Curated annotation (Swiss-Prot):
Function field: Responsible for the cleavages located at the N-terminus of the replicase polyprotein. Participates together with nsp4 in the assembly of virally-induced cytoplasmic double-membrane vesicles necessary for viral replication. Antagonizes innate immune induction of type I interferon by blocking the phosphorylation, dimerization and subsequent nuclear translocation of host IRF3. Also prevents host NF-kappa-B signaling. In addition, PL-PRO possesses a deubiquitinating/deISGylating activity and processes both 'Lys-48'- and 'Lys-63'-linked polyubiquitin chains from cellular substrates.
Portion of the full-length sequence here: 1025 to 1191 of 7096
Regulation: Inhibited in vitro by GRL-0617.
Catalytic activity: Thiol-dependent hydrolysis of ester, thioester, amide, peptide and isopeptide bonds formed by the C-terminal Gly of ubiquitin (a 76-residue protein attached to proteins as an intracellular targeting signal)
Name of the molecule in the record: Papain-like protease nsp3
The Macro domain, residue ranges: 1-167
Subunit structure: May form homohexamers. Interacts with N protein.
Location in the cell: Host endoplasmic reticulum membrane
Topology of the protein relative to the lipid bilayer: Multi-pass membrane protein
Source species: Severe acute respiratory syndrome coronavirus 2 (2019-nCoV)
Superkingdom of this protein's organism: Viruses
Amino acid sequence: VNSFSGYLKLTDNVYIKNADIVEEAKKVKPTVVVNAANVYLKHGGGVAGALNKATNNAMQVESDDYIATNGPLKVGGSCVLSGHNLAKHCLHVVGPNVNKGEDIQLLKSAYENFNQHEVLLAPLLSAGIFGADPIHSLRVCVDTVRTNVYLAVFDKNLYDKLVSSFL
Ligand SMILES: Nc1n[nH]c2ccccc12
């Protein structure tokens, strides 16, 4: 049993809810929240900007030190950093950004990072300002992630379309 409430069950291991991931993290304090990161961990907008704002910029400060030491992530890659006030850990995952011309086949590699964690609160990778089709992102998630994933989708219209169209 876990703390996650109000989710629709899509599969054995994937759950979905219309929710602001920031407000959900604040309520649950999950072991892992996933950030929709870029390779530079520059948390300007989208999910990353919202998560970072909720940490009062502490996520960005920590991320800048990580990049100064390690250099950029790979598209499809990830790193584990602090969850600050939102979670124990933040898994920063880089999905391909279609608005930069990145290979959508890297979306499966991105979701494979989730399998290193037994339970996660996450957004749909490569959705929103990363430009991919969220219906496709949900299909790759279900067909790739084997651990227990709680997906938070703030847009209500999109949430209803994802559920209604789910095979
Ligand atoms: N699914 C989401 N929860 N919170 C967000 C903030 C920005 C973009 C997407 C989300």
